[PDB]
Each structure stands twice: as C-alpha cells, then as structure tokens.
Amino acid sequence: VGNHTAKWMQDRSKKSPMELISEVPPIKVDGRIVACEGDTNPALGHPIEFICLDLNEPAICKYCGLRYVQDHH
Amino acid sequence: AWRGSISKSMKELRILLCQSSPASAPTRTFVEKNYKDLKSLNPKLPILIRECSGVQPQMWARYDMGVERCVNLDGLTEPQILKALENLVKSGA
Amino acid sequence: EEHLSRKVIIYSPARTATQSGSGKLGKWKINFVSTLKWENPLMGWTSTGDPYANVGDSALAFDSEEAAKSFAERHGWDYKVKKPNTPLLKVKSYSDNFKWKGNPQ
Amino acid sequence: MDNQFIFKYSWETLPKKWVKKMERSEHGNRFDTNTDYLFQLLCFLKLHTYTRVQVLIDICGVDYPSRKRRFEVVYNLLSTRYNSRIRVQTSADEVTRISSVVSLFPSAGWWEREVWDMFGVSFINHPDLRRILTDYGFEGHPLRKDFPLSGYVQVRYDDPEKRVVSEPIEMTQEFRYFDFA
Amino acid sequence: RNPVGGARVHFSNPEDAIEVFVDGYAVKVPKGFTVLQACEVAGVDIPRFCYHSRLSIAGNCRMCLVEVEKSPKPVASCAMPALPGMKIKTDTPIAKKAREGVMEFLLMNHPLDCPICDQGGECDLQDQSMAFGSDRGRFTEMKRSVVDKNLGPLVKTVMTRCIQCTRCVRFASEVAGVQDLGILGRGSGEEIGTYVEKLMTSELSGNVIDICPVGALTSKPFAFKARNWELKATETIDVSDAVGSNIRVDSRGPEVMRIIPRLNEDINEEWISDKTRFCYDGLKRQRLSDPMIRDSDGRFKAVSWRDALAVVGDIIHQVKPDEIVGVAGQLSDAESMMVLKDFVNRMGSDNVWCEGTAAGVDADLRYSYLMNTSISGLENADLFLLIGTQPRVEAAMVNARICKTVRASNAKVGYVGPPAEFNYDCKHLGTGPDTLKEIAEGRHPFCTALKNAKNPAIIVGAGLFNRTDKNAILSSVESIAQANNVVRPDWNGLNFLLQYAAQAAALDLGLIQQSAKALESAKFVYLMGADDVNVDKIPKDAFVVYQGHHGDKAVYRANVILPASAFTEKEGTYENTEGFTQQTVPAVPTVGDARDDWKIVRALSEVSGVKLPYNSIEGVRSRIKSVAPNLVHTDEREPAAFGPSLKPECKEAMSTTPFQTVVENFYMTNSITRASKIMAQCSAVLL
Amino acid sequence: IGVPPNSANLTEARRRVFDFFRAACRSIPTIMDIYNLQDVVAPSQLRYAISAQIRNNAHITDPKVIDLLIFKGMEELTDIVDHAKQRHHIIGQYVVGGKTDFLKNFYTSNYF
Ligand code: SF4
Ligand code: SF4
Ligand code: FES
Ligand SMILES: [Zn+2]
C-alpha cells in the first residue's frame, strides 16, 4: 500500500509482501541470539544471519524479514 | 583638475598588470603612486586593479552604453601611463 | 567530421574516498562529456543518441598524459588538461598521541 | 623440433637485421621484425629445410592506442613437417602500407582483407583488397579501440521510400559500462 | 619508483633524510616517517584498516604487519618509525602468514551479508580477502551479533559489520571536533556508539561513511539505491558555499545518485560538509523546466523560448535605462555574470550586482575580499581573531582547517560577534564594534596575546559588508592589522571570508551595486538565480524576470520564468574565498527545456537588439580576459600584489549595532538545498 | 590491380589523384542511371562535388595520407556503383539534388 510497493505492484487483490511479512508473529527464542537461514534446509534459504535480541523491539532478519524476540527477557 | 573629474567622464576604470614581470613594473609603480589620490578624488569611481601571472600591462575605461577603450601599457614609463589616463578621461568621455 | 570537432577533457581519475587502496591511479582518460540522455517512455530505460556514450570510460585508455594528448591532437579534438591532485606525505608519529600538555597555565 | 631448437637455430641462421626481438616462452616462440623484412622472413621460414613453416594459420591486428605505431599485426604459422608453431609480429600505423604475403600463402588473401576491414591497415601487392565483413559503404574500422561498440548508424525499413535505409543510431536503453576495477 | 598514488614528499633539508630498504630497494624518506610511509614512497601498497593518513595512528587492526630484519616479531608498519639502515620485507612468508591470520580473525564474526551491504563492490575487506588471505574459512562456531544504533537521518548503521577499527571515533574527536562517538565495553563485546541516545549533529558527520572501511556506517538516503560499478564518476566542484570543495559526482543515467569528497590538499582534504554531500536530492525536485509567462488570470502558462524572449525584449525597451536592474544569484558562474553585466551596461544601466551581503563593497583591490592567508596557510597561524563571522556555518571546511590548526599547533582563537557554538575552545571577546575599539586601543590580555603572536590571522566575515558603518569597521580592522604587523612580506594574516560561490568572481568582474536603493525604483528586474533577494522591496508594477533552476518567492513574483541549468549540468567558472579559480564539469543532462544561463542572457540580448561580440563560451572567456584575467587562468595560486597602504583614509564614526548572524540555517542556504527532503529532515532533527 | 606501394613523393601522388578523379567522373552516367537522377540533379554538380572533395584536402603534404585518401575514395566509389543503397536526396555521404546561427541553435536545444 506504501509508495515502495506502488512502484511495481498494480494489483490490489492480494496483500503486498510487506503486509504479509508483517502478519507473521515474532518467533520466541530462549536466549539472546538466534541464527536465521530462511529455510528448514539451509542450502535452500539465504546466507546465515546471526541476530541479537538484546532490544525490546522485535529483531528483524535482514534477508527474509522474519522477526525474533527473547522468550523470557 | 582632470584627475578630480574622472567619475564624470567614465563609469569604470580597469588596470591589468603582472605581479612580478619587469614589463609590468612601470604600471605597478603607477598604481602604488597614484591610486591613493585617484580614489580620494573619485570616491565613487570603481578602479579595478586586477593582477594576473602572465598578462601584458593594460588599462581599460568603460563609458556609457558599455562602450570601452583600451591602452597597451607595454614599453611605457610611469608619467606616460598618467598621460594615457588623462587622454582616456578627456577624449571619448 | 561532425564528431571530430567536439571538445574533450584529458584527466587522470582520482582515488575513490570509500577505499584506502591506491591501485587504480596513474591512468589517463579522455572525457567526451556525453551528457545527452533521456528516459524511454515504455519501460523507463535510459536512452541515448550520442555514439561516444561510454567509449571514454570502457575502451579508450592511455598510460600517460602525453599519449592521450597526442591521440586527441591527431584526431583533431579540442582538449583541455586537468592535472590530478596528489597527497602530500607528512611526518606522522605515534608518539604524538601522548604529547605533554605542559605545565598548567 | 622443440621450441629450444627453433630459438637457437633461428638465432644462428637468420640474417641479423631481420629480427628486432625474440621471445622464448611456453606461451609461444615469438619473432618481432620491421615491416620491410616481414615478407623475406616468412619466405625464409617457409622454404628453409630446417623450418618448413608451410601453413599460415592466421593474421590478426591488435590496437594499442598509446603507441606511435598503434597497430600490431600478428602472423600465426605452423610446420606440419616438424609439428611446431611460430608467431611473427610487426607494428604498423594508420597510413603505412605493409607487404602482402598472398604470393607466399594463398590463405592470407581473406585474413588481410579482414585486417583492412577491422583496423584499416593496407597491404601492398594484395590482388583484391576490399572490405569483407562489414556492410557495403561502411565507414570506420570497428575493431579500433576508439570505434564505439554500437557504431554510428543503424537500419530500418522506411515505408515512404519502400526500402531499408540507414540513420544515425538512437538507443532505447544505452549500453551500461560496469567498471569493477 | 613512483610513490603510491603519486604522493609528494617534501624535504625541509636534504641533510634531514634517512635511508631505508623496502624489499632490497633503496628509498630515501624524511626523518620521522613511519615504515608504512617508507613503503608508500617505495611504491609498495601495504594493506591497512585502522590507519588513516589524516587521523592519529591507532595500530589496532594489525593488518599492516611486515617483517623487519633483526626484529623478533612482525612489525606494525603504520606506527613504527623508520630508521636508517632498516631492512623492511613485505612479501616474506612471515608477513603473508600474519596477514592471512589477521584476515581470518577479521572475517570470523563478520556477517554474511555482502549482497545486502552497500559496501559491496567497493569494500576493502572483500579485496584484501581476495588478495592476501585466500584462505578457506574454517570457523564453524556461532558468530556474535550486535544491535543497530540510531545516529540520525544521515548515517545508517549496521554494527554487525564493524571491525572495531575506531576510525569513526578518532574522526569525531580529532576532525569534527564533536566528541559523541566512543567505544563502549571491553573485549569482543565492545561496541561503537554514543551510549546515550543522540544523533550526530556535526556538520562534518557524513565523512564517517567515507572513512568506515566496512558497511557499518553508510549513507541512509543512498541506502540500497545503486552499486558502485554502475555509477559514472564526474570530477567537479561544490557550489554550496564559497569554499569550492572538490567533489566526485556519481550518476546513473540522467540522475545524480550521490556526492563524495575529492582529494584537494589545499582546500578540503578529502572531507566535505553535510550540505555538500546530501543536497543532491533537490536537483530532481521543483525544477523549472519550461519558459512561462503569467496569463490573463495571473497564472503561469508554458510557452516556447522565442515567445518568452520576445516578450522580455519588447518590454525592456519601454523603461528608462536607470530603471533596469540585474541581480546575479549565489550559484551563478563567471561567464553568465559577465554576460549579464555586459547586457545591462549596453542597455544603459549600471545596476548589476551579486546577491548577498557583499553587494556594494569596494572591489578595487583584490586583497580586500579574499582570504589572503590561503586555507592551507592557516595551519601556520598561531592566533586566530574572528570578527563578525561564524565559519562553522559559513565555510565548514575553513572552520575544519581552523579546528585542525588549533588541535595541532595549540593556536588561540578570539571571537568578536554574536554568541555561537564553536567546536574548539575560543575566548568570546565581545559582540560588536566596541570590542574592535577596545582591541585597537589595547590594554587587554588578548591584545598582548595578539602582539605576542608570530603569525596572527584576522578573519573578517563578508556579513559585515552590508552594514552602514562598513568603512569604519574595515578601517578599524586594518588599523589593528597594521599595529600588530599582521601583513608582512613573509606573512599575509589579513582575511575576508566570503559566503557565496559566485561572490569572488562577481567582485572580480566588477558586479558592484552603486545605487543603494536602485531596486526600489526599478521597473525591469532580471533575477538571474537570485532567489535570496528580498522581493517585496521591488515595486509592485515592476516587470520581474526570473531565470534559474529552482525558486520559491521570486518565482511567485516573476512575470516571466526562464529555466536555467544547474551546476551539475554545465561547465562554469567559480572562484572560492582564497582567490582560487576552478571549473565545474558536466555530469548529467539538463531537465526539460532548460538552457545555460549565459546562453539565455546572450539570446535575450540578441532579441533585445544588443549585439554582444561573442557567440560561444570561449568568446565569453576571451571577453573576461579583458576584465578579470585571473578568472580564465584556472587552477593557479597567485600572491597579492597590493595591500592596505593604497586605501584612502576614512574618518567615519563607529556605530553601536552588534554583529548579526549571516547563516540562520546551515541546511537552508540556497534554492537547491531548500528543495531537498534530506536537508529539510536535517533542519527538523539535526538543528 | 594489386595495391601499389606508397607514393614516393607529391608528384606521383598528384598523378594518382588525377587518375582517381578521372575514374570518378567517368562513372557519373552510370550513377545517374542507377539512382534515376535525370530530373533531380545535373551531372556537373556531381563532378563539382567530387572536385570540391578533392580541393578541401588540398593542404595535405604527406604522400601516404594522400594515398590512403585515394584508396578510401576508390572504395567509396566502388560501393556507390556496385552496391548502391538508394535513398532520395542522398548518394553515399553526399546530399544530392535575419538572426545569427546562435539564436537558431539556442531555440533548437542546449547542446550546440
Ligand atoms: S563490509 Fe559488506 S561488502 Fe565488505 S565483506 Fe562485509 S558484508 Fe561484504
Ligand atoms: S563503525 Fe566503521 S569506522 Fe567505526 S570502528 Fe566500526 S568499522 Fe571502524
Ligand atoms: S593499519 Fe597498522 S595496525 Fe591497522
Ligand atoms: Zn532469515
């Protein structure tokens, strides 16, 4: 719906990828760090990304947009 | 009394000279010796002293309607640079 | 004929500011100042009609100022030379990080 | 007949004024010669019993814009008799004609036409020296470094004239030069 | 052997030179040079991350290790001083293995995000990994991760990529003069940051993007927009101020993508200001693209060039000659200013001047409106006296030079003018001309400090040039300079700081306002890019013609709009504060139906019936040779030929009005900057 | 038939120029027939264009440059005759059949 998506997406029947990724709830992790590969099979995903969870705001994987939060604190 | 009437005759006077060349030495002496009195007698006349590393000693006067005249100062002595100024002030002005 | 009368600039591209390495210097280029491009009104692609659009940065190169000047003067182009800026090496000491401030004033 | 024997024997036997530079390398034995001795050197190599360089594999030009003689003409040759290859090179500029070797190697005819078409080097005593690859009436020599990749003109059908015609080029999307250096 | 990058080596005396060997080779270096510098003189490029020639040596990255004979350990070449007879080896197995190990340690915790990192394609880490350590990774444990920090709208942060080289911290402390960045914590967990939430407010903050060797600090407005290999590089100059900072303009097609500094030891030393770096957005916004005449309903309508020029030419012959006024904009090049002056003088008017405070100054002597010390010459000054100027917001690179001189040589700074925030210690001496009288009369600790200074430097701002008591202020300043021997054959410490890129060339060409109230009595006003003139002083019935590439208020008042080229789209001559003349280089095509300014003026002159004796820019420059020949002798340094002695004595009284502030908003100074998102956001948050 | 050696001096080069000019002029009727120019342009204008091309290069003093120009002229003549590409007002490279220039160029565009 934003200006970025309107540059290429000319169909409003489906949600844009930005809205779709935002609807995925943050994944809870036991710990202060998590590694994201974007796929259950790492060779079929994206280069491994290690994400720090020290901040209260959910941390976003810069490759696939998955979000992670510390489960306890 | 012509030196006190330069403003009435021309809109702008330009003196181009070399900073270090011997050919520009009479022009530099003329500037150093006459600019004080010329500007005091003509407080509202722009007297543009423009020095350049390799220009021949020149002197320009700008009148009405943008008409200009130039005098080549090469091979001239300090008093003859003053005559040329008087000629520019008194004729064609 | 028509393209042999254009004005060009002979220069040595300086080092980029995003990298500390110096391995792309010493080359001399002929800038053809090709600055006539527009947008194709079908896909937004960048169109041009100037034959020397990229030859000065992709193919034509010269190892020295004199070679580029000779080539330009043989082809008859009007050229202006821009001397490259070079760094001045200055005496630097790691001891300077711990200079005595002197007696208090 | 290995490249050590060719280098040594050619040093011993060739007239000295023919060769300015001799390189021995796994990349190939290489002889550089002035343009006025190219023909005689090639005739010697072809006819001499200990060389028998009978096959002219090709002739090609290389453009070096930083050089006073910008063109380098390379002759790749083969001896089936001795199972050996030789490279002979000479330099040239935009106006100096060099000798044709068609009378030595008939295969040279078209390779010389190609050098003339692509680079603009002319060949003395060539029986039929005209362009061979480019379109008729082509202007310029495309393999020169200063010749633009897309050239200067393009063609299209023109209905009012009922024919294909040539106009100055107009590029919908210009060639993008990616400088990774 | 040629030095690396063609670097110049200056010897104070040949006796003060030592001899060292770099890989067998004999090289001669000055005493005090480091091993790395001796390698550069030898032409050997030593890899480095933490070392920067303009910043203090750190010696922490350990990538510059080399082998020195009789040394037990590998030697950090960036920090080790060179000694006579030293035998330096850079390609021995010890050095190669040390480089491989250090590179392996660097990549150990480095994130695998080259495809999303903007440094990709111009990354020192990538190149040195390809070259020195072509070792197959063997680290299989978990990498450390770091949260991103908020530093403002200019610097985008990805701290996982940071290699703790501390270049940004040292730049903040030593060059920017704003200590906001530090290194927090200890060990592998140390993090670069400000600890507390705060944005980088220094006007030189953007250079940390250049100095950061990895993609940890990147340009936020440029984020993700392009790769370095698809950008065309044009070497040109900046027109944001009167400094003339050397820049490289990167473009893709007919669009400027980014602006990065260009090395020039005499002007800006590979640094630029944030205004210079991030003003490129406005080049594609609110562009005047077509000629326009206001219609019957008082609305602009697009026309051809011939119709607009015919209208202007027809209406310019219906006014008195003294009623024609032409004003040149702050971004005008010398050629267009010369053509405008010729056109207006040939219609019988002398009301041609450049917009700004220095509109009607005495331009007879070139020393009186230029920085005679030169920017590089400031580093030799031991004392600074600033009179009515805020160099931090008026000339950012000059202020950077002053700060560097203060930090290095412990020079003192006295300031007279309104209160302002300096990035270096400085005594406030007063606020107005009473302070000048006190300085002239002596009896003050700063007066004896000025007398006890070997090479004092007075810097007078051009903002004082529009005051009513301008002659009195200038006379007092020159008397202070004479009493302290500021101007000597071996030292010219008298300086005047201009504010506009066009001001120096305009003063050289004689674009001087004679009548102080000529704008209030004009019926034909030609505003050649002069968007900063106050247009309510123009009579309501005057015919106003605006020529430029942007505009807010003058465009509203203008009866005719003539679209003009921008500085990135043309080749124009500009002179900076120190009298150095430079030329722009075209980087991108113009937009719409725009034309070069001098072309528009010449075309109008032809339409108006005046025949100028030139039809090309070469003819314009030949004409300029008859007025200001220094303007066509580009890229040349020349000393002053005449000084204060020729000035007539002045007896005007001294007013009591304090000095005012010239630049109220650093980011809003010209029409280009006022049309940029990024500059507006900087004004919103960074001020 | 074969490509001759370079002219030794300006005299023999001038002789080659005269030979080329004669060959070019003698081919004018063939060109008029091939391009159907009877009602478009006179044969003398073709002769005049060829001679003007020869005259515009009258300042050349190097025989090798003259030989190259003659060779190129022969090739262009051969392509014009043997492999004609008919346009209308144009044969090969020649067009067949109160304000100064600055104002016209300014009205045209910003690139002169
Ligand atoms: S800084 Fe960026 S480009 Fe360089 S190695 Fe790291 S991720 Fe790759
Ligand atoms: S952010 Fe960049 S410049 Fe600062 S310490 Fe990290 S790698 Fe070095
Ligand atoms: S460059 Fe010397 S240790 Fe970093
Ligand atoms: Zn992911």
Burial class (CB in 10 A: 0-12, 13-18, 19+), E40: buried
How many domains are there within chain F? 1
How far is Cα E227 from Cα E112, in angstroms, rounded to an integer?
Answer: 18
Q: Which residue of C90, C98, C105 is the best one to mutate when testing the E interface, meaning the one whose CB has the most E CBs within 10 A?
A: C90
Residue E426 annotated as lining a ligand binding site: no
Distance CA E602, CA E617 (A): 11
What are phi and psi for residue E364, nearest 5 degrees? Answer: -60, -45
Three-state DSSP at E324 gives strand
Q: Is E267 helix (H, G, I), strand (E, B) or coil?
A: coil
> What is the CB neighbour count within 10 angstroms for residue B59?
21
Chain E residue nearest residue F103, CA to CA: E603
Let me know: does E181 contact E190? Beta carbons within 8 Å.
Answer: no
The minimum-distance atom of ligand 3 relative to the CA of E79 is 2
Query: D180 is written with which tokens?
Result: 């990774």
3-state helix, strand, coil in chain F (%, to 5): 60, 5, 35
Cβ <8 Å between C35 and E5: no
Distance CA E607, CA E306 (A): 9
Pairing of strands D98-99, E324-328: unpaired
Instruction: Provide the resolution (angstroms).
Output: 2.1
Instruction: Give the per-residue SS3 of A9-37.
Output: CCCCCCCCHHHHHHCCCCEEECCCEEEEC
Residue of A nearest to E117 (CA): A62
Residues near E567 by Cβ (< 8 Å), separated by ≥ 6?
Answer: E236, E239, E331, E333, E584
In the Cβ-directed half-sphere of E166, how many Cα atoms lie within 13 Å? 16
Q: What's the E218 CA to ligand 3 centre distance in angstroms?
A: 22
Contact E544, E519 (CB under 8 A): no
Q: Which residues of E396-409 are buried (b: 16+ CB within 10 A; e: fewer)?
A: bbbbbbbbbbbbee
* Closest C-alpha residue for ligand 1 atom 1: E214
Q: How far lies E477's CA from each of E416, E439, E472, E486, E496, in Å?
A: 12, 9, 9, 11, 11
Angle made by CA atoms A49, A51, A52, in degrees to the nearest 5: 160
- E75-76 and E65-68: which strand pairing? antiparallel
Would you say the CB of residue E217 lies under 6 angstroms from ligand 2? Answer: yes
Q: Residue B34 and residue B17: Cα distance in Å, rounded?
A: 15
Q: Which residue is listed with tokens 């001896």? A: D79
Q: Is E348 in the pocket of ligand 3 (CB under 6 A)?
A: no
> Which three-class secondary structure state does DSSP give residue E386?
strand
Residues 6+ apart with CB under 8 A from F64: D95, D96, D97, F6, F7
Distance of CA E667 to the CA centre of its chain: 13
Within 13 Å, how many C-alpha atoms sit on residue C94's CB side?
16
Check residue E174 and report its DSSP letter. Answer: I
Q: Is E415 helix (H, G, I), strand (E, B) or coil?
A: strand
Please indicate whether residue E122, judged by its CB atom, sits closer than 6 Å to ligand 1: no
Beta bridge partners of F95: F90
Q: In sequence order, which residues have a C-beta less than 8 Å from that of residue C6 and are 6 or more positions away?
A: C32, C33, C52, C77, C78
Largest CA distance in chain B: 35
Q: Is C21 in CB contact (< 8 Å) with chain E?
A: yes
Environment class of D78 (CB within 10 Å of its CB; exposed 0-12, middle 13-18, buried 19+): middle
Query: Nearest C-alpha of chain B: how many angstroms from E656?
Result: 25
Cα distances from F87 to residues F42, F83, F95, in angstroms, run: 17, 13, 10
DSSP string, E418-463: S----SS--EEEESSHHHHHHHHH--SHHHHHHHT-SSEEEEEEGG
3-state secondary structure of E293: strand
Distance CA E501, CA E496 (A): 14
Using CA atoms, how far apart are residues D80 and A68, in angstroms rounded to an integer?
72
E371-382 core/surface letters (b: 16 or more CB in 10 A; e: else): bbbbbbbbebbb
Cα distances from E501 to residues C97, E460, E505, E526, in angstroms, run 37, 17, 8, 20
Chain breaks in chain E (C to N over 2.5 A) after: none
Closest CA to E268 of E204, E326, E219, E328: E204
Domain range enclosing B27: 1-93
Nearest Cα residue to D101 out of D110, D109, D93:
D109
Cα-based distances in Å from E476 to E44, E435, E482, E489 = 55, 11, 10, 21
- The Cβ of residue D142 has, within 10 Å, a number of other Cβ atoms equal to 14
- Bridging pattern class, strands C46-48 and C37-39: antiparallel
Query: Rounded CA gap, A5 and E239, in Å?
Result: 36
Structure solved using which method?
Answer: cryo-EM
* Ligand in nearest proximity to the CA of E63: 3
How far A29 CA lies from chain E's nearest CA (Å)?
Answer: 15
In sequence order, what DSSP letters do the residues of chain B get, joined into one string?
-GGGGHHHH-SEEEEEE-SS-GGGHHHHHHHHHHHHHHHHH-TTS-EEEEE-TTPPPEEEEE-GGG-EEEEE-TT--HHHHHHHHHHHHHS--
Residue E106 makes CB contacts below 8 A (sequence gap 6+) with E49, E61, E63, E125, E163
| Annotated binding residue E279 | no
Q: How many CB atoms lie within 10 A of CB E668?
A: 17
E262 vs C91: CB contact, 8 Å cut-off? Answer: no
Q: Which atom of ligand 3 is nearest to the CA of E46?
A: 1
Q: Assess whether the C-beta atom of E50 lies below 6 angstroms from ligand 2.
A: no
* List of chain E residues whose C-beta atoms are within 8 Å of the C-beta of residue D178: 229-230
Sheet with E232-237, strands from edge to edge, namely: E232-237, E246-251, E256-261
DSSP H helices, E157-206, are 167-171
E44, two tokens: 């050997």
Q: Is E27 in contact with E40 (CB distance < 8 Å)?
A: no
Contact status, residue E647 vs residue E429, Cβ threshold 8 Å: no
- Structural domain of F20: 1-97
Q: Which atom of ligand 3 is nearest to the CA of E76?
A: 2
3-state secondary structure chain C: CCCCCCEEEEECCCCCCCCCCCCCCCCEEEECCCCCEEECCCCCCEEECCCCCCHHHHCCCECCHHHHHHHHHHHCCEEEEECCCCCEECCCCHHHHHCCCCCCC
DSSP state of E410: -
Chain E touched by D171 (CB under 8 Å): no
Residue F111 lies inside a defined structural domain of this protein: no
Q: What share of chain E is helix, strand, coil (3-state, %, to 5)?
A: 30, 20, 50
Residue written as token pair 């000491």: C93
Å between D120 CA and nearest CA of chain C: 15
C43 and chain E: CB distance < 8 Å anywhere? no
Indicate the DSSP class of residue E175: I
Does F112 fall in a domain?
A: no
- Among the listed residues F106, A30, E269, the one whose alpha carbon sits nearest the alpha carbon of residue C90: E269
**Ligand 1 pocket residue status of E117, Cβ below 6 Å:** yes
The total domain count for chain B is: 1
> How many Å apart are CA E333 and CA E581, to the nearest integer?
11
d(CA E603, CA E611): 10
**Does some domain include residue F102?**
no
Q: Which two tokens stand for residue E338?
A: 């010369």
Greatest C-alpha distance within chain C = 76
Instruction: Compute the nearest-CA separation of F104 from chain E (Å).
Output: 10
Euclidean distance between CA atoms C76 and E392, whole angstroms: 48
Name the residue among B32, C26, D34 with its Cα closest to residue E4. C26
Q: What pairs with residue E259 in β-bridges?
A: E249
Residue F40 CA to its chain's centroid (Å): 18
Chain mean position to CA D35:
13
User: For residue E418, which of E455, E393, E382, E401 has the smallest C-alpha distance?
Assistant: E393
